Design an enzyme around this catalytic site. Structure first.
Site, PDB file in Angstrom:
ATOM      1  N   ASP A 153      66.950  27.973  -3.531  1.00 33.68           N
ATOM      2  CA  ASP A 153      66.397  27.449  -2.342  1.00 33.68           C
ATOM      3  C   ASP A 153      66.267  28.066  -1.301  1.00 33.68           C
ATOM      4  O   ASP A 153      67.286  28.863  -0.684  1.00 33.68           O
ATOM      5  CB  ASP A 153      67.334  26.318  -1.898  1.00 33.68           C
ATOM      6  N   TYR A 160      64.351  31.754   6.699  1.00 38.56           N
ATOM      7  CA  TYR A 160      65.521  32.630   6.328  1.00 38.56           C
ATOM      8  C   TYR A 160      64.966  33.844   6.150  1.00 38.56           C
ATOM      9  O   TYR A 160      66.010  34.977   6.207  1.00 38.56           O
ATOM     10  CB  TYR A 160      65.876  32.126   4.824  1.00 38.56           C
ATOM     11  N   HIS A 220      60.396  21.554   6.646  1.00 39.24           N
ATOM     12  CA  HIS A 220      62.039  21.822   6.683  1.00 39.24           C
ATOM     13  C   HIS A 220      62.502  20.737   7.597  1.00 39.24           C
ATOM     14  O   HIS A 220      63.686  20.430   7.623  1.00 39.24           O
ATOM     15  CB  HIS A 220      61.946  23.136   7.431  1.00 39.24           C
ATOM     16  N   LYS A 247      60.045  26.299   2.321  1.00 37.17           N
ATOM     17  CA  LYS A 247      59.802  25.201   3.533  1.00 37.17           C
ATOM     18  C   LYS A 247      58.865  25.809   4.615  1.00 37.17           C
ATOM     19  O   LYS A 247      58.872  26.899   5.105  1.00 37.17           O
ATOM     20  CB  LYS A 247      61.260  24.817   4.054  1.00 37.17           C
TER      21      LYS A 247
HETATM   22  N1  LIG Z   1      67.062  22.181   4.883  1.00 38.16           N
HETATM   23  C1  LIG Z   1      67.865  22.392   6.021  1.00 38.16           C
HETATM   24  O1  LIG Z   1      67.763  22.511   7.043  1.00 38.16           O
HETATM   25  C2  LIG Z   1      69.082  23.247   5.539  1.00 38.16           C
HETATM   26  C3  LIG Z   1      70.195  23.314   6.633  1.00 38.16           C
HETATM   27  C4  LIG Z   1      71.348  24.107   6.083  1.00 38.16           C
HETATM   28  C5  LIG Z   1      71.454  24.457   4.509  1.00 38.16           C
HETATM   29  N2  LIG Z   1      70.227  24.511   3.644  1.00 38.16           N
HETATM   30  C6  LIG Z   1      70.170  24.905   2.529  1.00 38.16           C
HETATM   31  O2  LIG Z   1      71.295  24.577   1.733  1.00 38.16           O
HETATM   32  C7  LIG Z   1      72.227  25.869   1.585  1.00 38.16           C
HETATM   33  C8  LIG Z   1      73.555  25.732   1.142  1.00 38.16           C
HETATM   34  O3  LIG Z   1      74.058  25.162   2.567  1.00 38.16           O
HETATM   35  P1  LIG Z   1      74.826  26.163   3.643  1.00 38.16           P
HETATM   36  O4  LIG Z   1      74.188  27.473   3.646  1.00 38.16           O
HETATM   37  O5  LIG Z   1      75.109  25.153   4.654  1.00 38.16           O
HETATM   38  O6  LIG Z   1      76.316  26.359   2.585  1.00 38.16           O
HETATM   39  P2  LIG Z   1      77.141  25.526   1.580  1.00 38.16           P
HETATM   40  O7  LIG Z   1      76.524  25.495   0.602  1.00 38.16           O
HETATM   41  O8  LIG Z   1      77.608  24.403   2.435  1.00 38.16           O
HETATM   42  O9  LIG Z   1      78.330  26.910   1.562  1.00 38.16           O
HETATM   43  C9  LIG Z   1      79.375  26.765   2.819  1.00 38.16           C
HETATM   44  C10 LIG Z   1      80.013  28.260   2.472  1.00 38.16           C
HETATM   45  O10 LIG Z   1      81.034  27.960   1.058  1.00 38.16           O
HETATM   46  C11 LIG Z   1      81.293  29.173   0.762  1.00 38.16           C
HETATM   47  N3  LIG Z   1      81.755  28.872  -0.742  1.00 38.16           N
HETATM   48  C12 LIG Z   1      80.569  28.672  -1.837  1.00 38.16           C
HETATM   49  N4  LIG Z   1      81.311  28.629  -2.858  1.00 38.16           N
HETATM   50  C13 LIG Z   1      82.369  28.453  -2.535  1.00 38.16           C
HETATM   51  C14 LIG Z   1      83.593  28.251  -3.529  1.00 38.16           C
HETATM   52  N5  LIG Z   1      83.398  28.113  -4.931  1.00 38.16           N
HETATM   53  N6  LIG Z   1      84.825  28.308  -2.915  1.00 38.16           N
HETATM   54  C15 LIG Z   1      85.085  28.599  -1.736  1.00 38.16           C
HETATM   55  N7  LIG Z   1      84.143  28.793  -0.905  1.00 38.16           N
HETATM   56  C16 LIG Z   1      82.704  28.527  -1.226  1.00 38.16           C
HETATM   57  C17 LIG Z   1      80.303  30.012   0.984  1.00 38.16           C
HETATM   58  O11 LIG Z   1      80.943  31.242   1.593  1.00 38.16           O
HETATM   59  P3  LIG Z   1      80.634  32.721   0.592  1.00 38.16           P
HETATM   60  O12 LIG Z   1      79.162  33.245   0.802  1.00 38.16           O
HETATM   61  O13 LIG Z   1      81.830  33.756   1.267  1.00 38.16           O
HETATM   62  O14 LIG Z   1      81.105  32.196  -0.759  1.00 38.16           O
HETATM   63  C18 LIG Z   1      79.031  29.427   2.129  1.00 38.16           C
HETATM   64  O15 LIG Z   1      79.200  30.160   3.179  1.00 38.16           O
HETATM   65  C19 LIG Z   1      71.556  26.986   2.591  1.00 38.16           C
HETATM   66  O16 LIG Z   1      71.666  28.093   1.987  1.00 38.16           O
HETATM   67  C20 LIG Z   1      70.125  26.587   2.477  1.00 38.16           C
HETATM   68  O17 LIG Z   1      69.468  26.895   1.299  1.00 38.16           O
HETATM   69  C21 LIG Z   1      69.267  23.796   4.254  1.00 38.16           C
HETATM   70  O1  LIG Z   2      68.003  25.848   6.604  1.00 43.23           O
HETATM   71  C1  LIG Z   2      68.822  26.337   6.997  1.00 43.23           C
HETATM   72  O2  LIG Z   2      69.697  26.819   5.910  1.00 43.23           O
HETATM   73  C2  LIG Z   2      68.901  26.502   8.254  1.00 43.23           C
HETATM   74  C3  LIG Z   2      69.884  27.569   8.524  1.00 43.23           C
HETATM   75  C4  LIG Z   2      70.156  27.755  10.004  1.00 43.23           C
HETATM   76  C5  LIG Z   2      69.692  26.831  10.940  1.00 43.23           C
HETATM   77  C6  LIG Z   2      69.031  25.746  10.595  1.00 43.23           C
HETATM   78  O3  LIG Z   2      68.264  24.716  11.663  1.00 43.23           O
HETATM   79  C7  LIG Z   2      68.134  23.631  11.426  1.00 43.23           C
HETATM   80  C8  LIG Z   2      69.058  22.743  10.848  1.00 43.23           C
HETATM   81  C9  LIG Z   2      69.040  21.316  10.824  1.00 43.23           C
HETATM   82  C10 LIG Z   2      67.731  20.660  10.962  1.00 43.23           C
HETATM   83  C11 LIG Z   2      66.855  21.730  11.261  1.00 43.23           C
HETATM   84  C12 LIG Z   2      66.654  23.005  11.667  1.00 43.23           C
HETATM   85  C13 LIG Z   2      68.641  25.501   9.137  1.00 43.23           C
END
Ligand SMILES: NC(=O)c1ccc[n+]([C@@H]2O[C@H](COP(=O)([O-])OP(=O)(O)OC[C@H]3O[C@@H](n4cnc5c(N)ncnc54)[C@H](OP(=O)(O)O)[C@@H]3O)[C@@H](O)[C@H]2O)c1
Ligand SMILES: O=C(O)c1cccc(Oc2ccccc2)c1
Length: 313
Positions: free
Chosen positions: A45, A50, A112, A79
């Site tokens: 993803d 990013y 996005h 996205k």
């Molecule tokens: N569409 C959007 O607007 C949107 C918004 C936010 C996120 N995203 C996508 O979703 C992805 C994931 O969401 P997120 O970035 O919010 O993070 P997340 O998946 O909720 O991870 C949060 C933290 O969990 C830690 N972690 C991972 N595996 C673990 C484990 N087995 N045990 C303990 N800690 C663990 C990581 O730290 P370490 O790296 O130190 O392991 C990471 O910083 C993002 O990278 C992005 O690709 C999209």
């Molecule tokens: O896609 C992400 O990992 C990401 C990372 C940082 C900020 C962010 O911003 C938004 C969050 C929620 C809704 C719109 C925009 C998205």
């Protein structure tokens, strides 16, 4: 380990989150995406936002070059960022993402966010974010043309609420439904009603921040509870002799949610694919469903004052 999308393509049910804040060097995305692929992740993803599509796409091409996977074994998502909603900007944005990754197509292209911004964070002279008004039905028609062109196998949305998704589903002469809606979803904000609505429409819900978010101070209150310290998740990790992260990921799979997991840590990247190695009982799922508390970690003035803020409903 795949789910069949509503356009007939398949999406792996565990995906690798690639976002890391600007204080992490760009070269780390290349290294960790390779490690993720080595560990067994097949859904990757990314996004224009990013600023890592070159490194992530290089990691994918590198694993294709060394014989570990074929292109067809990898599901790559990018996205459309919110400054490119105007429909004439959609295809060029996608082609720019593809040129950055050096790939001929993405598996999935998403809008996005519904929160349109002036054509990454445009700000006026006070510090206030500059919004835009765009008919996202026109954006969607531009996405559909990208699928017809073969630039994206599948197209979907992210951060849409039910009302926003309905607007696209009800669009006069809709050609392709969104395959997915990628949204914040975890045991403190489990999106049960939105998930039902998506299931009713054969749309997959993809959970981001499923492990409680990176808690970036730009958008997340550091006073918020830390999801992976939760006592129910702890108690369930001790019962299964797993970890609270693995409980939170397995919860999503058993609800029919495709789940992302970011980690830039070698051990945790390999840990997370353990999600397929165990299962939770109904009483375990009921205990996790009981943690729901309307808690979105992304909770910022930069979103909440937008006319198209998804959490207004
Ligand atoms: N569409 C959007 O607007 C949107 C918004 C936010 C996120 N995203 C996508 O979703 C992805 C994931 O969401 P997120 O970035 O919010 O993070 P997340 O998946 O909720 O991870 C949060 C933290 O969990 C830690 N972690 C991972 N595996 C673990 C484990 N087995 N045990 C303990 N800690 C663990 C990581 O730290 P370490 O790296 O130190 O392991 C990471 O910083 C993002 O990278 C992005 O690709 C999209
Ligand atoms: O896609 C992400 O990992 C990401 C990372 C940082 C900020 C962010 O911003 C938004 C969050 C929620 C809704 C719109 C925009 C998205």
């Amino acid at each position: 380990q795949c789910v069949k999308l509503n356009d007939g393509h398949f999406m792996p049910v565990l995906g690798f989150g690639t976002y890391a804040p600007p204080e992490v060097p760009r070269s780390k995305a290349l290294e960790v995406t390779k490690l993720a692929i080595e560990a067994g992740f097949r859904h990757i993803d990314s996004a224009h936002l990013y600023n890592n599509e070159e490194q992530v796409g290089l990691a994918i091409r590198s694993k294709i070059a060394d014989g570990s996977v074929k292109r067809e074994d990898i599901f790559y998502t990018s996205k459309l960022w919110s400054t490119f909603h105007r429909p004439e900007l959609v295809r060029p944005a996608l082609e720019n993402s593809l040129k950055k990754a050096q790939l001929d197509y993405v598996d999935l292209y998403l809008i996005h966010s519904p929160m349109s911004l002036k054509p990454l964070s445009p700000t006026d002279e006070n510090g206030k974010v500059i919004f835009d008004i765009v008919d996202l039905c026109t954006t969607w028609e531009a996405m559909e043309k990208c699928k017809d062109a073969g630039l994206a196998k599948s197209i979907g949305v992210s951060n849409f609420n039910r009302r926003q998704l309905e607007m696209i589903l009800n669009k006069p002469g809709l050609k392709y439904k969104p395959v997915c809606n990628q949204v914040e979803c975890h045991p403190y904000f489990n999106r049960s009603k939105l998930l039902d609505f998506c299931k009713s429409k054969d749309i997959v819900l993809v959970a981001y921040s499923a492990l409680g978010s990176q808690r970036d101070k730009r958008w997340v209150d550091p006073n918020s509870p830390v999801l992976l310290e939760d006592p129910v998740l702890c108690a369930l990790a001790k019962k299964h002799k797993r970890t609270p992260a693995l409980i939170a990921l397995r919860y999503q799979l058993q609800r029919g949610v495709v789940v992302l997991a970011k980690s830039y840590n070698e051990q945790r990247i390999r840990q997370n694919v353990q999600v397929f190695e165990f299962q939770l009982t109904a009483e375990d799922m009921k205990a996790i469903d009981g943690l729901d508390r309307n808690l979105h970690y992304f909770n910022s003035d930069s979103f909440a004052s937008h006319p198209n803020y998804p959490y207004s409903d």
